[PDB]
Amino acid sequence: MGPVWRKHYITYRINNYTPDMNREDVDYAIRKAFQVWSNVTPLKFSKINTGMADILVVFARGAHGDDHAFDGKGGILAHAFGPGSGIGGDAHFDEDEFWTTHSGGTNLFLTAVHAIGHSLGLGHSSDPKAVMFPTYKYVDINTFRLSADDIRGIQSLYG
Ligand SMILES: [Ca+2]
Ligand SMILES: [Ca+2]
Ligand SMILES: [Ca+2]
Ligand SMILES: [Zn+2]
Ligand SMILES: [Zn+2]
Numbered sequence: 494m495g496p497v498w499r500k501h502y503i504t505y506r507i508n509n510y511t512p513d514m515n516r517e518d519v520d521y522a523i524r525k526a527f528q529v530w531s532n533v534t535p536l537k538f539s540k541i542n543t544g545m546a547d548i549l550v551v552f553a554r555g556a557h558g559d560d561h562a563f564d565g566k567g568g569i570l571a572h573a574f575g576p577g578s579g580i581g582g583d584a585h586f587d588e589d590e591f592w593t594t595h596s597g598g599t600n601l602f603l604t605a606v607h608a609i610g611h612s613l614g615l616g617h618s619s620d621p622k623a624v625m626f627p628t629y630k631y632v633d634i635n636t637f638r639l640s641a642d643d644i645r646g647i648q649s650l651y652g
Contacts, residue, residue, distance in 0.1 A: 506546035526605035
């Protein structure tokens with residue numbers, strides 16, 4: 494019923510990089526996360542380095558200029574606005590978390606897949622196998638796959 498992007502070419506921009514990770518690893522994690530959803534839809538995502546992107550990717554802590562403060566280490570890991578102009582689509586990651594490429598800390602790739610779900614208009618799944626389940630779970634990110642419920646969800650919006 495809700496907001497959806499009404500175009501197939503979507504842009505994203507990385508506003509700032511967490512110091513927790515190698516810059517190339519931030520780039521690859523977010524890229525790979527967008528690929529997850531483009532693999533099952535007609536959407537295409539392109540990274541831009543200047544200008545206004547649809548989806549601004551931000552690492553920030555506490556109160557950071559929207560109405561939804563972060564809460565320090567623990568609890569909230571990230572949030573994302575649904576499709577829309579301005580802040581719509583934007584995905585914010587709590588810098589008080591310790592972001593990684595692996596099972597330690599909080600995996601940036603897995604969090605971004607979930608956050609980007611929301612940026613594309615998905616809500617939460619009650620299916621504990623689904624990436625859009627509300628609770629973070631680390632799974633070997635090599636071999637990661639969307640569930641049938643996640644696929645049904647995003648195809649209900651875009652496909
Ligand atoms: Ca936006
Ligand atoms: Ca937090
Ligand atoms: Ca951090
Ligand atoms: Zn925010
Ligand atoms: Zn969520």
